[PDB]
Symmetry: D2
Subunit: 309 residues, 4 copies
């Protein structure tokens, strides 16, 4: 039975995101095996060696340049392989995603898909459609990183550990996402309550703070050329919640079955995740304004999915 | 300047609590040195050896049987071993007994030149936190009690178990004086940001009387554990190690602690349990949760009963 | 397949060792479930609650007062339940051990046994005999703690992190165990080499240091009444080596199949351990003096086993 | 005194190495503050934001685009971005180029009042470690180079893979000047205390030529990784974070580092790779492994070639 006490991850895409993700899993000692799949075979071999060079300072792992067929007995397939009209972007990514998901399913893979490729909510739905897997075993990173960025920006404004800050970005990851100010809090004190006790914090600083979250990727790409440490860390956090069976609440792309009056899309909302994937979708009671933001995000996303399929 | 990158903790009290605390600090790699002070010198020497036997499986430390004078260059003095309430002793006698013992600890620690943070877990904690402040002459923000940290953990783990969620995704406080007068802040309690009131609307199989009972079981948790296994220690040891990490890693973490009231909740000149921000300099901000009328009344009744005992004890 | 990503430990014995072990597993986030089995049902219920009170500060776990029947789908059964002539001590512990192992096997348990009850090498062999399990899936703590004590004592003499100190105690845990000075080193510099560079270290300090290791339990019991933090920590280290599939070298009680000229006993030697238990028994080439110490430890232990069975 | 329980690292160089190093420090929770200094100011600002985006999943930090003057109260200055060898540049030109750049880093850092430890990873590391010592005026034991830390990890992981053992149970060194002249200490290399010579006797399917090749692959590892993926960074970033933890947690850990030779191996007045004990005060003890005649010759040839370049560079 202890023959099972070996956690295996297949990573698809060895760009800055996949490579950083593998490094995060090395340093935190999450899983015992990482197979790295990418068209660029030389690069994945180089990365597997560079990452392996770190292992003497952490817990051991088998790290290698892998093939889709190595997903047969994987716990976790992480898809980062995303090509940069919105509908053309989707059609291009659907053909690439089919070339990933089909051979992975053909391997006998029977674990959880974790999708981080842009656009994530659409490609999460597409992964579900192509794979034939249950809804709860296809997960997208959704607004996990936007939420982390939001919490860290509040943490810095108020000089508090972001782990004591509780706020969500929800909807489709992208321009239509929105902040759930109504439930956002610091140690259980709502932002509305916090602003009353600390009125140096102007409404316009909060507006700007959400705008900086929405435009974060643009600002980072402008400064250093790409974004990767954030999403790599989020993917490793989601990976730990699955592999350690945590029943952790994370904001993820999850299948709408009536939540917020939505159906038959993947979109960002807090959910409970454990070894079996999504257990519970948390439906935060939104204000009329927040519910409208959710409906506009959903509707625009549903239109693109319909047109794409 | 890196000569200072050595964190030192002086633990006063080598009971089940102090001992478990030191073990938590060993396994989590918090601090580089633990001096254990107790009247029972052989026991502290035995514990220092037993704890040291663990070190080859974790980060290294100097662990030893210590004296008050070893607090000179300590970052942290952790006070655990409160003289226990005898049958038919008044609360005020319990306090007076603990004040004479506490004076015999705090005075020689201050005399050593100790200039760090006091972390008080001795029962009764809110009163002995105030007493440590009074005896030490230290600033308000450098005398901290464990307060409702454990009651809050117990409350969060109870909600976690009812709802099948990691307690790290559950956010609820017990506040007031640690003891019979403490109360749950249901108004701000939430699971991943969904208030308990909101959660109960979506899941109405959860009856009001299960929630009432759940707070009652938290209030009476120590009595239930003492009845079953004779003593309580893993909970408070873990809480003390969490507070110790928040200080020593300068986290600005929000934790429910005994902190000095300067108008918060309409209270003054007591230590009592409420969320606060804590870093390397101790208490940075006291969070004043806007309480319902019922929750504010519970806070006032806890505070007033505690203030009466302190007043009577100092005179 | 991710239905398997749930590690379960059944602990037998909720005395200071078992209870400290469970606490170590809580603080280090090892396994997702601990069942605590003991005659004293009230005490195990109290301990499961006290340990659960810690969980909000660490990774989640299911911790409960358990029955032998709960071992059915356990990864790991840890036996600490040991009653304090040597042959009478063994006969008393064999009847108690039979009352543990039989109902655990009857449950359908199909994991690894980790034995810490005194006397450990004898009860490790007895666990193998009673269980019918393969040799490599019955492991004793053996000289893991004596070895830790030895390394920490060298660490303190020389002011070096014990993790940079490499020395073994081997043989039967107890009076006949011996230090392997021939291979003992600090950062790869043998103790013989270290003493040449640092001749303030007298041979008689080294003799005393092994004597203090052999008598460590006596000295600690005299001072504080019992010994538990050491073995609790060692048991949690061995548990991590199994559950994270490390192929770690640890000094353990393992089955002699010709190593050191020994057969058909469990005795202390370094071994490789992973998710499947013992993979490789390291046979350290001993000096004539060290080999004699091993043979005398083995022979006295083999006589007691023969007489007991 | 707890005002000091704030560990600060100034990183010089925000290339793949510096950036990966800062990420390793974020994920492992080492230090409370990282200032990133590089000529490319936009890149450091972008990195500080990207790294900060990770913080809600780990322990908190202040991460920012920094200047040399921010080293004033730093514990640790980590120097990574060495000007790379151009095709047909001499070794001595590489050194002279790096000395002018290194002077422009070390002088303003010393001028800030910085009084911590220098940790040098810039190529060529043993030479720039000596140069940092010469430019800074700091004591020998407070200027440390990464030396053969990564070569040693690569060597241990290669043995781990041959034998199917956790590399943490494998104990082998590469020593000398990091680069083509470095050598394996086979004589003291072991797996759980069993020397490689002993292991090969018990497992004679392991051929001498596989061991020769295994050291050759370690020596040429960087060339092989650069050929395959264009650059090397996870290895050295992880090593730098391990050395950083040994200093900041005062571990007295044995690591293979660039340390000042004062008679060890018959060497004087160079930095070169050998195991040493390191704590909060830097280098405490240099371990002198008794080398075979062949291993000692390799050490002498590595040292002498390195000493010639240093002599020529300083004059």
């Amino acid at each position: 039975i202890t023959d099972k006490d070996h956690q295996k991850v297949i990573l698809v895409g060895d760009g800055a995101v996949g490579s950083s993700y593998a490094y995060a899993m090395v340093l935190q000692g999450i899983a015992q095996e990482i197979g790295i799949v990418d068209i660029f075979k030389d690069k994945t071999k180089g990365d597997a060696i560079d990452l392996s060079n770190a292992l003497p300072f952490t817990s051991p792992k088998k790290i290698y340049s892998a093939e889709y067929s190595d997903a047969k007995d994987a716990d976790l397939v992480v898809i980062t392989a995303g090509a940069p009209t919105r509908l053309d972007l989707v059609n291009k990514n659907l053909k690439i995603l089919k070339s990933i998901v089909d051979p992975i399913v053909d391997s006998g893979f029977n674990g959880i898909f974790l999708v981080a490729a842009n656009p994530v909510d659409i490609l999460t739905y597409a992964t579900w459609k192509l794979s034939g897997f249950p809804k709860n075993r296809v997960v997208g990173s959704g607004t996990s990183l936007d939420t982390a960025r939001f919490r860290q920006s509040i943490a810095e404004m108020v000089n508090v550990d972001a782990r004591s800050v509780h706020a969500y970005i929800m909807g489709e990851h992208g321009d239509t996402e929105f902040p759930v100010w109504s439930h956002a809090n610091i140690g259980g004190v709502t932002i509305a309550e916090w602003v009353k006790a600390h009125p140096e914090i102007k409404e316009d600083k909060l507006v700007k703070m959400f705008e900086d979250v929405r435009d974060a990727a643009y600002e980072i790409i402008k400064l250093k050329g790409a974004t990767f440490y954030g999403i790599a860390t989020a993917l490793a956090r989601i990976s730990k919640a699955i592999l350690n069976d945590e029943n952790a609440v994370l904001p993820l792309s999850v299948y709408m079955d009536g939540q917020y009056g939505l159906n038959d899309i993947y979109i960002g909302t807090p959910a409970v995740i454990n070894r079996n994937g999504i257990q519970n979708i948390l439906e935060i009671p939104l204000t009329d304004h927040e519910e409208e933001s959710m409906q506009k995000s959903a509707s625009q996303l549903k239109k693109v999915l319909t047109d794409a399929f």
